[PDB]
Amino acid sequence: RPEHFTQPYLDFMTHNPTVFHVVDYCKQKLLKAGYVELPARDSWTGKLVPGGKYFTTRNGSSIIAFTVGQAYKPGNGIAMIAGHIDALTARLKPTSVKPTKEGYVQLGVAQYAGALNETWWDRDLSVGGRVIVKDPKTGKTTVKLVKVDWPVARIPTLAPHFGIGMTGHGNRETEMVPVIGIDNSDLPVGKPGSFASTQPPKLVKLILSQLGLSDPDSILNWELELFDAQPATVGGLDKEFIFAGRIDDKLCSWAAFMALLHAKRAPTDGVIKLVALFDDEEIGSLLRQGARGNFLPITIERILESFCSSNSVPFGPGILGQTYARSFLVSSDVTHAAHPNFTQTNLPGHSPRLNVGVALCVDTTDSVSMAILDRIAELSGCVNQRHMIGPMLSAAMGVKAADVGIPQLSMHSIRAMTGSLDPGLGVKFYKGFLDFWEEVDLEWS
Amino acid sequence: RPEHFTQPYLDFMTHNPTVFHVVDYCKQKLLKAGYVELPARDSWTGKLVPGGKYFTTRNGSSIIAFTVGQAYKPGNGIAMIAGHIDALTARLKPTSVKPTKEGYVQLGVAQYAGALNETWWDRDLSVGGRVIVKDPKTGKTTVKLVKVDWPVARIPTLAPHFGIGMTGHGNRETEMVPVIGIDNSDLPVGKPGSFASTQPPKLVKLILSQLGLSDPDSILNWELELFDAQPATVGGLDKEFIFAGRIDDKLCSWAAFMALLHAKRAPTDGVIKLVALFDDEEIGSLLRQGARGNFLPITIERILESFCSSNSVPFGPGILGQTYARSFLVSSDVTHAAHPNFTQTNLPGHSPRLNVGVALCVDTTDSVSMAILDRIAELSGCVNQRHMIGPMLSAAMGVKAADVGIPQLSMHSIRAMTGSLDPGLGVKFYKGFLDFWEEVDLEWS
Amino acid sequence: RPEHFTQPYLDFMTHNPTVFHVVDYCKQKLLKAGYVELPARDSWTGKLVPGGKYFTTRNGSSIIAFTVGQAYKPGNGIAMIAGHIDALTARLKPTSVKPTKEGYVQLGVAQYAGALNETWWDRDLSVGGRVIVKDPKTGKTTVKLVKVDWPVARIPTLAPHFGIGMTGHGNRETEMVPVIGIDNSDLPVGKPGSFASTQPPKLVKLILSQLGLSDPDSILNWELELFDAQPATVGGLDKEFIFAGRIDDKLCSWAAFMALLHAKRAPTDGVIKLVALFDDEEIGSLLRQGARGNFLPITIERILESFCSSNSVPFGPGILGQTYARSFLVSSDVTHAAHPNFTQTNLPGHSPRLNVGVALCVDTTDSVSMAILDRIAELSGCVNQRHMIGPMLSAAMGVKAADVGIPQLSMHSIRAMTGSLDPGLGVKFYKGFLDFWEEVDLEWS
Ligand SMILES: [Zn+2]
Ligand SMILES: [Zn+2]
Ligand SMILES: [Zn+2]
Ligand SMILES: [Zn+2]
Ligand SMILES: [Zn+2]
Ligand SMILES: [Zn+2]
């Protein structure tokens, strides 16, 4: 079964370039699997029920999905997995328009997370994100997703012949300005104060067509980024490899998500099985949608308070915290696979292989956490590797936790690699955790 | 009386080398003094009663102990002390086994804190920690403490004759690899995939005998570290000094703990007297057992909600926070004593002496905090010093707070020093705070 | 049998911290074994006898002991071993008193031979040496040994927090000044011209109590040093290691000494068997008690002249030198064992192992010397190693010679390392040399 996840992972990576696409992807699969959305502005305290499946969203870039076991009662524990779905990228400036320079049309961008490193030069870049549109019919402000299907942007290297490097000194504001087109005419869209006037005129027209809008003044704002247009693929002589960009945690997040969809719901399951995918981890994770934010804790408190009303039980501290005491959090970010050409950096016995299994990262993880996940791995038919050179929902909730990752090479590159079976082996371990946590917890004292 | 704590402190330091021994030490003395343990998974909302004495544990490395005044009612303040019981130490790697090299058997370790500094060379190192054992009788997973009573490990310097230093370049992964034994045979324990196989065979057998086990496959994991085998002692011509390692906060923590054990329970005490000892402050103090984690706030809320049930009072924000507004938090970490040989680093009037009293550390502390603790010091018969070059439970609970410390030389050394009266003077001040806080708070407006 | 020397070596190291204690230790064992002291101011030319046993002393820091074979006649050779019993240490200055500074009482000291090094920081240091006392009963000037049984002194590191290192710039004069006590009174013994007045007042009183003396002016002078108070011990998982300080040649000297005490006296022994232990090799060994001084040569000439009287043979050059031509000198200083973490410094084939045997050091040693001692090792049941990166009584006497050493790690550290069987393996070899030299010499031409 692990190879059964290779191409679905490939298609996921290719067609969901931005964090907004990822949540939209997860949201449509959860709805087709029968999950019910819980809007934050609505009262939940009536409507949660054992055997139910739910999800909730924040800023359309953060999502928490969970299933409540049929044997669930207030005070029972949660098996939860956390990951981040943001990736290093380059966002269009509030004013992205630039002067046409030596006949080239350029684009103002800002490196989001420190993204524009040497691997970004001479890549075919496309654009995508969300647009804030004022709907023609309703007069309500809305959000729509957009993507250009061919490369519009590029950051060109300089020839080595000039004595500098090809990358120059590497300065991102002067030398890394993307090139989006040609205008040689030396040989404008929207009312002068509008948003559209701050952006390149063909970018606006291109975006308006994809949204089926004609009036530039319908666009209040957008959030757009550049991403590598090259599809995810398998490679190697035997196709053991996956080549794709944005692997830093779209990989572990996708695996955790698929784990939840594929998890058991046994009539005897007494725990809540939960996956939390967060935005903004490469900036530290503290923002409304980040992992150091209220999002997951207040969601958990809402769920528990909801079941407390149904059972006429008082909600408070220590019904919460009897819950936390019975819970376990797997915090999953990608880890470094053994690098064959920098062996300086491979700590022996602690440097994970590709196409083997998940690595337990140690420096959150500790002897108890490792005993728990090694045991789960055995019930799952998984082998757990070790790696050493937002993990800290653990502190916010006082939940026992471990750091866990799928091995990867060239982390933070615009295009990285893992083994072709690593997504599936990931799904296999996470599913093993959600399914066996409650059983394993009862083997302790 | 301060001298009456010198040998008890000595014995404490000598026989409790790891954070797990410290909690076990506190737990046995709390139980012998009649404290009741509150397990997180159980409901407390019935049990708590004025005049009662309790404690709670997290991961066996974090502990919170408190007494409820007989005059206590919901809304009354808490007099609380926080400290950390972790110390810089070197933890065994997940795979601690190494190739025998030039006839030596070595041990894979990782500096936990940033610990392995120059003072760690040529010290007699022993090993200790916790083991995750599979009880053959019950079949339940358990935890046991272990210690080897003689030095097993050493990090040898190089002779100066070779042109390098004795310490070399100081690189921790190549040049400081402990040496645990000799094997010259060039002139194995457990099923090949088990945990025992990742460890030195001879350490595993040594650990199994200490725990009275035969089969290597009964050990699922362990958490072991290296510590200095040399006992704590008194020193100097007049025995004014205490020479011991791991003083960075085992000292302030132990004195705080003893203050609680020695505090008044007057029939007129209306506050709660609490001590919180945390793990992982040298790592920034957030994960599950850390100081910027859930542990102390959720415990306090649980206690308050419990007494709210008993008195049929609603629990919520503003019964909590009336509580916080009547509270005070002494966050106690060790401080730097005047160093006689680096006088450049001694800020005059702000550089505390040994065998005098506790230092108020200023850079949390403020004119109000100092007014209170100077006032408590006067009722206690104490003299407070000043020091200047997890404090931030204060922000999490909005509690009035100060940073307080017992002066020390050679902080973060494998072996440090303070005055022989400094533990006692510590207990004396902390006891003064817990006993007099409520009285002092009523002198204000 | 080599294990039979482990604890007696451990006890020797622990209780004889200074060169003065070493000579006193050797002296009482020689006397208990029936050796006769030869005072330098007395004529010996009557009093030496075949089968006799004798020793001689210089400054109470140097000693030469020997046995005369029963078959001895003038012109017969000597099997002699030479070593040094001084060790790197810190002497008290002539005026050790210091100003009390920031409440600390300090002690003026001087490094004896580049001794204070990185490993001397944060060690528990005690004091010992000899005292020159004025005898009240007799009025004679005399010498007494003294040792304090608990740590009186410490050289404290600075916390890393201050931006310097813990060791500072390392300057031994301002930054390494030992700390002996506390005086906070800012919050004396003897006539003002006497020796006692130049020293710390409580040091003087402490020393006087140990010698059972009341009057400070009975002390004319003393020679005192700081040494590591930590006992010698065995360590390692199976206790294959010895951890002790001052191993540089207390180890080889002690082994040589016990070899003499354990040597054969066969009725057919025709050679003198002799051990010379010298002071000050770390200073290059020229002064009265050093190895480049007259001590051993003039003692040998005295012995030879004495037996020339008894046999009415003329003494002169060429009865001496027939003697030297039949002799052999084993010059024994410790050597560097293979270091497992600096392999750059281990010369393959030439880097000796712990718990194997003595290494023959080559750079005095030569093809002839090696053939002799390899042959002696075979008769003794010993394994000789090779080592490669004052031996020069060889030049003074024109005696054939070799440099041999017991391997050791971290030479010149305040606390070094050897194998637990290495002292024993040392005495086994040295005994082999003394017993078999005459036999082996007759296998040559
Ligand atoms: Zn990252
Ligand atoms: Zn990541
Ligand atoms: Zn610290
Ligand atoms: Zn601290
Ligand atoms: Zn030396
Ligand atoms: Zn030497």
Residue numbers in the entry:
A (entry chain C), B (entry chain A), C (entry chain F): 50 to 236, 246 to 421, 427 to 452, 463 to 518
Sentences copied from the publication:
The earliest discovered selective autophagy pathway in Saccharomyces (S.) cerevisiae is the cytoplasm‐to‐vacuole targeting (Cvt) pathway, through which hydrolytic enzymes are sequestered into double‐membrane vesicles, termed Cvt vesicles, and transported to the vacuole 8, 9. The best‐characterized cargo component of the Cvt vesicle is the vacuolar aminopeptidase I (Ape1) 16. Ape1 is synthesized in the cytosol as a 55‐kDa zymogen that includes an N‐terminal propeptide (hereafter referred to as prApe1), which oligomerizes into a dodecamer 17, 18 and further assembles into larger aggregates in a propeptide‐dependent manner 19. In addition to prApe1, Atg19 also binds another cargo hydrolase α‐mannosidase 1 (Ams1) 25, 26 via a site distinct from the prApe1 binding site, thus forming the Cvt complex.
In order to further improve the resolution of the mApe1 EM structure, we used an Ape1 homolog of 40% sequence identity from the thermophilic filamentous fungus Chaetomium (C.) thermophilum (ct‐mApe1) 30, to exploit increased stability of dodecameric species when compared with sc‐mApe1. Moreover, we determined the crystal structure of ct‐mApe1 organized in dodecamers at 2.8 Å resolution. In the crystal, ct‐mApe1 is present as dodecamers, which are formed by two asymmetric units each containing six ct‐mApe1 molecules. Cartoon representation of ct‐mApe1 structure including the catalytic domain (cyan) and the ancillary domain (magenta). The binuclear Zn2+ center bridged by the bidentate ligand Asp259 of the active site is located at the top of the catalytic domain. A conserved histidine residue (His163) belonging to the neighboring subunit protrudes into the active site. Dimerization via the ancillary domains forms the edges of the tetrahedron (left). A book page view along one of the body diagonals reveals the catalytic sites (Zn2+, yellow spheres) that are buried inside the hollow tetrahedral core (right). The amino termini (orange circles) are located on the facets of the tetrahedron. The superposition shows a close structural overlap of the dodecamer assemblies except for a noticeable difference in the active site that is well defined in our structure due to the presence of the cofactor zinc, but disordered in the sc‐mApe1 crystal.
